[PDB]
Write a protein that binds this DNA or RNA. Structure first.
Ligand SMILES: [Mg+2]
Ligand SMILES: [Mg+2]
Lengths: 95, 325, 52, 57, 133, 107
RNA sequence: ACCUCGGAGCAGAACCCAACCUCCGAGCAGUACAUGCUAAGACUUCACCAGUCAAAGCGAACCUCAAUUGAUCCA
RNA sequence: CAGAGUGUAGCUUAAAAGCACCCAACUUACACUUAGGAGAUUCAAUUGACGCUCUGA
């Protein structure tokens, strides 16, 4: 009841090659999860070629750098633009 | 009028500044667990409970486990039923005593027999009632066995190197409650054998009245440091055998501590009648079970929107009455 | 869209019940309880009884 | 076949065992880096603040 | 001499008679609280507990690989535990249970195995009705 | 234009501490302003009723939805890792004991 | 222009509460075919009529939906 | 190489636990679930002696 000391006890609203590439993407996702970063989305973009994405948002420079290094440590990368090499992968950021 | 909460409100600490940083229970199981934990905790707002409610040994064990694993090598797992008897034995040896307490608590032996105050039955008591040749019907703590099977006194073992074995019904039959009926009383026993020890009160079978429910007999076993006197012939008089274990424990069992328990359920049977007639020498009491009558509101003069059944609810009874003609 | 129809039990004759069914589709057959027979029995559709 | 399956299970187990160690190692490495960073920031603070600020940017 | 109301005060009396009151409600909340005894299985990392509980919350009977007697000598482990419990149940005289798992839990093999073990032991997982009138 | 609907007369019909016989309706509502607790049922309207003779009591109890009911589960999942939902529950605390053993005869 | 029924505000916390006040909608669908029989005890749109809920029992298994409707006599 | 804090596997008003963690399957992937997996009181009689963290040289 409103006037009772147990007022808002129920209140809840306020609380609320290709294969290889895929594997790599998965790994990246896992890493992100581990390190506590928001993985927003992932795509399945179209000899043959195959692209995968891991959309990321919010990470400080030092931490970000570390993450990048870990990713670096095959196929390719593309996010300052930071490309590298060993089908295709493209971890687009939003820091 | 907005009153502040008496103690701390739930969900206060976890809301925080941001919601998107936290872990959230992606599962249900975690949530369930949390809920359970919360329930277990007390709170200030009434609430459910208000209204209703060695190292070496370890190392050895580890080694054994390792050995087992090696033996398996695992393949079997990739379907082994395991020996149960051995497990049971182990339990008896080690945490059986611990377990027994819980059962006792559930069954209200400590509250009724000892007036409160729990204790661990350390020494494992092993009783069994003989039924023909074999098998001996074992009195495991909690078991249902009939008074036909309990007509003659049982065989007892425990593997312990003095004792006093007792057996009492906790309900208090026939006469007023907070009373108990003893079935025998073995005393000043040396070691594992009953025949060597003395007997004051000899064995009756259980004698639960018909439709009285289920009764809970209890064997008791204590540790004797000092040998002691006790207190009445081969008697079947009921007014002698009425005795409560609490008072007895208090005014006498001072150089004594109980170490072994086993409780045993009883119902009506054809032997009960015999017991009542032959040795007790009286008419056996029959016990039904009567529920309280149906409610109904007060008799209303113009019932209004009830059916023609209104009048059948208030009537004594059924047959057609003819007033005066 | 929906028709009302009467359904006649084969066993436990005399007992008829009223049900819905779409106007476009099949004549209805249905298992259902007869309290006369005191068993489940097949009813068959017979005569529509208003349409709606 | 049975034998093959048995082999396979063992192999899988081995793989699992391997992976966890690697993961642990990675974690350790990360932790080390973090520690270094923590040290470094403190040092910067102690020494010259402008530089620290720049680093942070 | 005999009294009119002999008061048998065995806690489990009205359960075996199949007359004592089950808690009827909680039809929104899970699990349903209408049972004399409930088989609560609690799985974790390492060890798998199994319990027998009343409405009160008093754990009457249990079996776990933590209890170290059965740690001597996983689905198999679970099965073993269940078997042990069944034996325990028999000794206690709890031959009836209610088992209200989550759907996933129900589906799971370990749970099934446990159930089977219980059945073998001689403990039904349904429990008789209250008997009114 | 529009509708003018009559008052629905819903709400609590029996308050905490009232003696409520088996069958008495306790509280009527659309949606769950109260939930069924011990010995309290739910009709098709969500209306709460006493399943036994006894006294009504109200309590704020932790709420766990049924696994099969999806929306609630989702909500639960959404909440942060130390959160518990809580909800109000209505119980009947039974008075008269179901049974009394009486002496029929001496046979 | 409206005339029956329902949901939200006015009507902020047990019900109740108007206007040719402000705003949404309904006059159906879908799944069944034990939408079988009966029955303690309640609620009720401020009357009545209409509505609602419903333990147990006997029969059987192993309802969704807010509104979704209409008396009597007559056919 | 001299001192101080101590010293249950990642982590705990745990006492060999529970949380974390790993592999496979379902998953675009994550998540959930189901099967499996692996882990510890640093060591000698509350005292001493090996390991870290930290401060000196
Ligand atoms: Mg009225
Ligand atoms: Mg019913």
């Amino acid at each position: 009841y409103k006037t009772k000391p147990t007022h808002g006890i129920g209140k809840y609203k306020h609380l609320i090659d290709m294969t290889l590439a895929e594997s790599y993407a998965q790994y990246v996702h896992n890493l992100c999860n581990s390190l506590s970063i928001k993985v927003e989305e992932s795509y399945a973009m179209p000899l043959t070629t195959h692209e995968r994405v891991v959309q990321i948002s919010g990470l400080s420079a030092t931490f970000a750098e570390i993450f990048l290094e870990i990713i670096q440590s095959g196929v390719r990368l593309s996010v300052x633009x930071x490309x590298x090499x060993x089908x295709x992968x493209x971890x687009x950021x939003x820091x | 009028r907005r009153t502040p909460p008496l103690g701390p409100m739930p969900n206060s600490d976890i809301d925080l500044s941001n919601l998107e940083r936290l872990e959230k229970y992606r599962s249900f199981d975690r949530y369930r667990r949390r809920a359970e934990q919360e329930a277990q905790a007390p709170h200030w707002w009434r609430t459910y409970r208000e209204y209703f409610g060695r190292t070496q040994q370890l190392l050895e064990r580890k080694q054994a486990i390792q050995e087992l694993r090696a033996n398996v090598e695992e393949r079997a797992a990739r379907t082994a039923s395991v020996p149960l008897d051995a497990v049971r034995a182990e339990w008896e040896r080690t945490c059986g005593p611990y377990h027994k307490q819980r059962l006792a608590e559930y069954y209200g032996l400590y509250r009724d027999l000892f007036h409160g105050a729990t204790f661990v039955p350390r020494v494992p008591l092993h009783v069994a009632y003989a039924v023909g040749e074999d098998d001996l019907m074992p009195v495991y703590c909690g078991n249902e066995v009939t008074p036909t099977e309990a007509a003659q006194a049982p065989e007892v073992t425990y593997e312990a190197e003095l004792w006093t074995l007792l057996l009492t019904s906790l309900d208090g039959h026939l006469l007023e409650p907070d009373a108990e009926y003893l079935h025998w009383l073995l005393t000043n026993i040396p070691g594992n054998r009953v025949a060597e020890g003395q007997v004051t009160c000899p064995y009756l079978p259980p004698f639960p009245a018909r439709g009285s429910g289920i009764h809970r007999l209890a064997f008791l076993l204590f540790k004797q440091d000092q040998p002691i006197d006790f207190s009445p012939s081969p008697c079947y008089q009921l007014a002698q055998r009425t005795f409560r274990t609490f008072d007895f424990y208090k005014k006498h069992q001072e150089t004594m501590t109980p170490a072994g328990l086993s409780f045993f359920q009883c119902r009506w049977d054809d032997s009960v009648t015999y017991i009542f007639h032959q040795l007790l020498d009286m008419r056996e009491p029959v016990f039904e079970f009567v529920r309280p009558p149906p409610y109904h509101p007060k008799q209303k003069r113009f019932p209004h929107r009830q059916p023609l059944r209104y009048l059948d609810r208030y009537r004594d009874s059924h047959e057609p009455t003819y007033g005066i003609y | 869209k929906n028709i009302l129809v009467r359904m006649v039990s084969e066993a436990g004759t005399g007992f008829c019940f009223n049900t819905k069914r779409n106007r476009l589709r099949e004549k209805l057959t249905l298992l259902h309880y007869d309290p006369v027979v005191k068993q489940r029995v097949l009813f068959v559709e017979k005569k529509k009884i208003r349409s709606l | 076949t049975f034998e093959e399956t048995e082999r396979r299970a063992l192999l899988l187990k081995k793989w699992s065992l391997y992976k966890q160690q690697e993961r642990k190692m990675e974690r350790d490495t990360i932790r080390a880096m973090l520690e270094a960073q923590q040290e470094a920031l403190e040092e910067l603070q102690l020494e010259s603040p402008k530089l620290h600020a720049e680093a942070i940017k | 001499a005999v009294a009119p109301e002999f008061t048998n005060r065995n806690p489990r009396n009205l359960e075996l008679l199949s007359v004592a009151r089950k808690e009827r409600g909680w039809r929104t909340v899970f699990p349903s609280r209408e049972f004399w005894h409930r088989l609560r299985v609690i799985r974790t990392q390492h060890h798998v507990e199994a319990l027998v509980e009343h409405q009160n919350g008093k754990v009457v009977v249990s079996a776990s690989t933590r209890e170290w007697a059965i740690k001597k000598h996983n689905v198999v482990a679970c099965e073993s535990i269940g078997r042990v419990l069944a034996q325990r149940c028999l000794e206690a005289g709890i031959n009836f249970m209610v088992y209200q798992p989550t759907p996933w839990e129900a589906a799971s093999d370990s749970m099934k195995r446990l159930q089977s073990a219980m059945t073998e032991g001689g403990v039904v997982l349904r429990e008789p009705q209250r008997i009114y009138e | 234009l529009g509708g003018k609907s009559s008052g629905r007369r819903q709400g609590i019909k029996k308050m905490e501490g009232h003696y409520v016989h088996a069958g008495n309706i306790i509280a009527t509502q659309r949606h769950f302003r109260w939930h069924p607790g011990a010995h309290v049922g739910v009709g098709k309207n969500k209306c709460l009723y006493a399943l036994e003779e006894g006294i009504v009591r109200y309590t704020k109890e932790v709420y766990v939805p049924h696994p099969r009911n999806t929306e609630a589960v989702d909500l639960i999942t959404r909440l942060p890792k130390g959160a518990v939902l809580y909800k109000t529950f209505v119980h009947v605390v039974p008075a008269k004991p179901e049974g009394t053993f009486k002496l029929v005869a001496m046979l």
